[PDB]
Amino acid sequence: IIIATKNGKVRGMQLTVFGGTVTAFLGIPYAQPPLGRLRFKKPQSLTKWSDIWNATKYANSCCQNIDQSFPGFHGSEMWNPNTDLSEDCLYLNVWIPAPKPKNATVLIWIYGGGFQTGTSSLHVYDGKFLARVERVIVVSMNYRVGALGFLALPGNPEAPGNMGLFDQQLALQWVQKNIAAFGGNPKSVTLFGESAGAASVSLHLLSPGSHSLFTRAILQSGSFNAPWAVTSLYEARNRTLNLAKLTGCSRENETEIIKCLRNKDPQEILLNEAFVVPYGTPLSVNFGPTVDGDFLTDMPDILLELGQFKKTQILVGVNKDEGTAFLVYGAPGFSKDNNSIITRKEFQEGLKIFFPGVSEFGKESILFHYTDWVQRPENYREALGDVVGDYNFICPALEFTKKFSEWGNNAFFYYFEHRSSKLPWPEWMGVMHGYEIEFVFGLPLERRDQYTKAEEILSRSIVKRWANFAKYGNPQETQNQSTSWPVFKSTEQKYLTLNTESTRIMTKLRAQQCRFWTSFFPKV
Amino acid sequence: IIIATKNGKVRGMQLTVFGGTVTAFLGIPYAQPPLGRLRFKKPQSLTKWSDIWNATKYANSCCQNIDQSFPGFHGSEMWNPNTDLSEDCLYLNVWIPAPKPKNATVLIWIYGGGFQTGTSSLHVYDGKFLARVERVIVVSMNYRVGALGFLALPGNPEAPGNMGLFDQQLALQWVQKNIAAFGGNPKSVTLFGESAGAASVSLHLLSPGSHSLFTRAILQSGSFNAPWAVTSLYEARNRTLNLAKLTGCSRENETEIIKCLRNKDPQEILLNEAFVVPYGTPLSVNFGPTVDGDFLTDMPDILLELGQFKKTQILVGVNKDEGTAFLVYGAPGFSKDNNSIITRKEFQEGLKIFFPGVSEFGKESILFHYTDWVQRPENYREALGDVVGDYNFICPALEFTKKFSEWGNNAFFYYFEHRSSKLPWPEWMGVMHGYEIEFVFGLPLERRDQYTKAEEILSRSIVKRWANFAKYGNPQETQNQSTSWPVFKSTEQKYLTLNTESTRIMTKLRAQQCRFWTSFFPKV
Ligand SMILES: *[C@@H]1O[C@H](CO[C@H]2O[C@@H](C)[C@@H](O)[C@@H](O)[C@@H]2O)[C@@H](O[C@@H]2O[C@H](CO)[C@@H](O)[C@H](O)[C@H]2NC(C)=O)[C@H](O)[C@H]1NC(C)=O
Ligand SMILES: *[C@@H]1O[C@H](CO[C@H]2O[C@@H](C)[C@@H](O)[C@@H](O)[C@@H]2O)[C@@H](O[C@@H]2O[C@H](CO)[C@@H](O)[C@H](O)[C@H]2NC(C)=O)[C@H](O)[C@H]1NC(C)=O
Ligand SMILES: *[C@@H]1O[C@H](CO)[C@@H](O[C@@H]2O[C@H](CO)[C@@H](O)[C@H](O)[C@H]2NC(C)=O)[C@H](O)[C@H]1NC(C)=O
Ligand SMILES: *[C@@H]1O[C@H](CO)[C@@H](O[C@@H]2O[C@H](CO)[C@@H](O)[C@H](O)[C@H]2NC(C)=O)[C@H](O)[C@H]1NC(C)=O
Ligand SMILES: *[C@@H]1O[C@H](CO)[C@@H](O)[C@H](O)[C@H]1NC(C)=O
Ligand SMILES: *[C@@H]1O[C@H](CO)[C@@H](O)[C@H](O)[C@H]1NC(C)=O
Ligand SMILES: *[C@@H]1O[C@H](CO)[C@@H](O)[C@H](O)[C@H]1NC(C)=O
Ligand SMILES: *[C@@H]1O[C@H](CO)[C@@H](O)[C@H](O)[C@H]1NC(C)=O
Ligand SMILES: *[C@@H]1O[C@H](CO)[C@@H](O)[C@H](O)[C@H]1NC(C)=O
Ligand SMILES: *[C@@H]1O[C@H](CO)[C@@H](O)[C@H](O)[C@H]1NC(C)=O
Ligand SMILES: [Cl-]
Ligand SMILES: [Cl-]
Ligand SMILES: [Cl-]
Numbered sequence A, B: 001i002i003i004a005t006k007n008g009k010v011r012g013m014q015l016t017v018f019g020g021t022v023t024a025f026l027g028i029p030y031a032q033p034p035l036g037r038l039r040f041k042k043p044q045s046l047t048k049w050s051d052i053w054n055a056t057k058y059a060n061s062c063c064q065n066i067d068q069s070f071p072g073f074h075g076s077e078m079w080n081p082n083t084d085l086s087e088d089c090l091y092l093n094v095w096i097p098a099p100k101p102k103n104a105t106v107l108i109w110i111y112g113g114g115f116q117t118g119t120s121s122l123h124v125y126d127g128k129f130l131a132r133v134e135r136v137i138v139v140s141m142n143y144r145v146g147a148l149g150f151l152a153l154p155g156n157p158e159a160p161g162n163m164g165l166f167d168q169q170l171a172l173q174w175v176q177k178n179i180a181a182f183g184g185n186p187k188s189v190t191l192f193g194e195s196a197g198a199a200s201v202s203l204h205l206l207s208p209g210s211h212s213l214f215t216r217a218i219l220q221s222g223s224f225n226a227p228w229a230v231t232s233l234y235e236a237r238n239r240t241l242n243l244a245k246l247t248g249c250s251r252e253n254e255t256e257i258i259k260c261l262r263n264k265d266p267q268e269i270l271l272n273e274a275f276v277v278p279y280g281t282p283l284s285v286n287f288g289p290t291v292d293g294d295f296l297t298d299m300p301d302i303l304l305e306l307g308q309f310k311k312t313q314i315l316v317g318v319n320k321d322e323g324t325a326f327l328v329y330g331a332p333g334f335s336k337d338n339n340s341i342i343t344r345k346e347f348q349e350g351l352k353i354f355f356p357g358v359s360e361f362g363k364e365s366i367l368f369h370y371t372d373w374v375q376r377p378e379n380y381r382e383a384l385g386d387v388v389g390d391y392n393f394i395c396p397a398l399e400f401t402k403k404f405s406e407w408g409n410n411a412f413f414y415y416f417e418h419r420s421s422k423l424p425w426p427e428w429m430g431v432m433h434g435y436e437i438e439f440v441f442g443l444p445l446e447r448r449d450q451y452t453k454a455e456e457i458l459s460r461s462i463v464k465r466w467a468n469f470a471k472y473g474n475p476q477e478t479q480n481q482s483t484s485w486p487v488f489k490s491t492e493q494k495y496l497t498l499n500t501e502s503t504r505i506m507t508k509l510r511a512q513q514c515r516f517w518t519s520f521f522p523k524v
């Protein structure tokens, strides 16, 4: 099966899925390889080829450091790249239903990884189930991460910042230009992403250059107002300068720093990324989105507050235990291989790990809010995970949702509270960050895969809600006497819970905690 | 001029005021002298006399410690008793217009003094101007203060607690029974009081036994939810026991403690009051109102929250610099005789003076809220006064007013921001606690008295607003193109400013500060 695109012909492959067929185009190029003089620059448009480009396997993932904390452990290693790393990584994937759809709604996935890691080729991002079951087209792209994606010297087109966000945007344009040839509708495009991919989705809502490149947006565990999501101009300069220093690239002409940096081996850039900050945390985002005056015209908090964003429906959600994953990457007394009962003093040390440049009064105030017990051995263990999850993910998603909904548009908020029966991490970690993704992509619809029946049904329903959101702007499941998902409004603040037992309409998720993070904490 | 009362005849005296005449009955007894076996007991009803009781001078003030901090200084000494002290102090005063009114509205004054001091005979509480100018009747009473008024052993009728509040109540009853004989209307009775007298007024709103004894209420700089106004059952026991210890009255039968205490000289009781707490502040209320199960049936915060109070109009207000008066009674670096520029470290020490049993985190949180400057030498001096005024007076009055108004009734809130031209305290102390009182009582209407013309006019208007509140439930001045005083509602929270220049309608007095005291601080 060959499809003609604006730039040339591409050949896909056929896949058998659930007694049916999906056509996959894995590894289509969508920009000039950002090599040599192009390193650190905005992606450049691709020139046409003749002959048939073979899109029959996943392409290279972008250069990135890897999680080596737990070698041989599936819980961590499932997130590591499963394709060669290369600066030559600007590729995308298309999954289309078979037979070819006529005008299918398009779902475009943006992976997370803290803007430092990730790739579109992970097993948990495999778009074939969605294409099979919902007759949507799924698109996913690789975008540059780390310094190669986000090194910033404000205004300097040699290293303008946000390059990885421009990679995402050029791929959204590729879909606008090319997806009708695959039977897709460019006027019915939903972005969806998780963590940094969700924060990325939220920034496309703010970027004028992305306005016309999509219809609706889904934000899983992330948004651009999360404390890790946007690098200040101040931090970004300092970090670019530290990178320069660490690589023998300290200069006077700023364009001489970049020219020098362009001569370094990709691997020398990667090795030095960790150290550009004096004290990092497990949630460090050394190189991330900045206000560059191009993709992002002003501090995004100001844009959100004042209603300067694309007016459309949003679907937003978080997981019950967002913060737990992070505790075993540096918090004292924690371990994936025991129940991690910590003491008051370990808790206090843990705050120091997660809030390194925060005043002592700042830290005691967290302690004060989070240690008024209602004792129980796991009090402290549980509080630290909640601290981390509320501050970094839940309260920001909830605030993003209130502020966005205040300008008129329908918003839907979910609280995912199901722990995978296959989860390789311990029980105390609960409903972890990243672990709704496999339900969204329909992995439990595969009966061979060892999930329970209740999980198949949960996945089926979520897949239907996401597809209905995408096609119709309303994440209902209308056929099986399902709980109706109410609009989230800043007054009532209704949200839907997602779980195998009984799905509920509830109100004001984390009301007390978020008042602390959102109103008070930003003052310290 | 002789008037027959239920208990006997009383003779008054005539007074010349503003080219007219007022009749004064100064020193009418309203209960059995609470002496001997009656010490610490609820006031007992007075038995009739024959012959004419001479009410021609102020009676004894109740026993109390005196402010000796500034001998010969008018600023402090104007508040000290100006009549002999005696346990034989249960007397009241009546000022009536001449000629005798037909059915005049009645204004009943309850003095403050932290429930430890005060008397109805102060020059600033002289009811003759009000009687002359507004043709109201003014009543005022002495009530027991300190341990003699408020010593509590819950449930024990030898020392039940709240005796001074029962003194106030028996005097309200005396007015119900006797004021028609003076030309007054028992159905048109407004209580007004300042500081502890205002807190007392607010408790009469909660006490079922006071329900039928008045119509409306005015609260100047105080309410029962202020942090100093109600003694916990816990503190009260401890304090009664410490008093016992200090006087050689420690016993086993609790009624043996009281019997012993009844043998002590009044002066030995007074001397020991200060020490019943390990650490007091300048705002200490050693012996005050308790939940006694009689005057007060439950924790007053619960009563207010749940709407269990007399449904009527209230007029509530505070002064611009409530907290300053207190700083020269123990805060380091402060003095009435210099400009009291303190440093950060003095500020911190001052918090320790005012918040002695408060966690170190509690104190830094005050510091954090109050030291974000917009530097200026008087930053710290000003912040400490604001801390003290907001916490102790302004935020509680504002909260009382919101909560009361939420049950349907009209409430009016004022912010008194005029500094007396005659104020003997320094300028840095500004618009002090206690210094609206002389405007309310019309002292500036006396032209001989050295006040400015703008002050005469301000006093005239306030007197008219208070009298209109009392007579008609609406503190308007309707004749002189005055700013209309809007109802205070918990949404808009409109208040009127009182000053010589221009009177304003403003909103949400101390919004940021009170969120701190009212929502957050009670948690520490
Ligand atoms: C801006 O960067 C400086 C640079 O210091 C860094 O040098 C880099 C090459 C890298 O190795 C990095 O780890 C190292 O810290 C930071 O200055 C440092 O600040 C800390 C304060 O805790 C000191 O302990 C370091 O000694 C100090 N180094 C120097 C040379 O001054 C600085 O903290 C940073 N500022 C910002 C914006 O956070
Ligand atoms: C309840 O009262 C006790 C009694 O202690 C007091 O004895 C009184 C007669 C009087 O002189 C008073 O000043 C004295 O403090 C309090 O116990 C005291 O607590 C403080 C703690 O700061 C200690 O430093 C004292 O040594 C200690 N004394 C004794 C004998 O224990 C106690 O604080 C108080 N509790 C409450 C309810 O606040
Ligand atoms: C869980 O495992 C961790 C790591 O193995 C344990 O934390 C260690 O405990 C002891 C003393 O507290 C020390 O030898 C190490 O320094 C600790 N490591 C870290 C990173 O804190 C922890 O004790 C275990 N807890 C259990 C079994 O509850
Ligand atoms: C205002 O007066 C007070 C009291 O007289 C001064 O505070 C004193 O200052 C010195 C040193 O700071 C000490 O000798 C005393 O211990 C202080 N007394 C108290 C109670 O703090 C203060 O210095 C004066 N401040 C001025 C002129 O600004
Ligand atoms: C692409 O795939 C086709 C079909 O098998 C093959 O014949 C062709 O040679 C391929 N082109 C390459 C390897 O570049
Ligand atoms: C796809 O649907 C859109 C409306 O969203 C319509 O305007 C467009 O022409 C359609 N394209 C097809 C069926 O080719
Ligand atoms: C509706 O329920 C049926 C079973 O009665 C199931 O086969 C189907 O997958 C469900 N549809 C959705 C979208 O959940
Ligand atoms: C009360 O005053 C009257 C009038 O002057 C006087 O004649 C009478 O004796 C007085 N009674 C006393 C002093 O008890
Ligand atoms: C006083 O006015 C009241 C109404 O508040 C009325 O009921 C009462 O009879 C009046 N008493 C007089 C004029 O004696
Ligand atoms: C109204 O103003 C006049 C002067 O025109 C003044 O004499 C009078 O006291 C004022 N009345 C009140 C109640 O303020
Ligand atoms: Cl929960
Ligand atoms: Cl359901
Ligand atoms: Cl002010």
Ligand SMILES: [Cl-]
Pocket (backbone or CB within 6 Å): B481, B482, B483, B502, B503
């Ligand atoms: Cl006016």
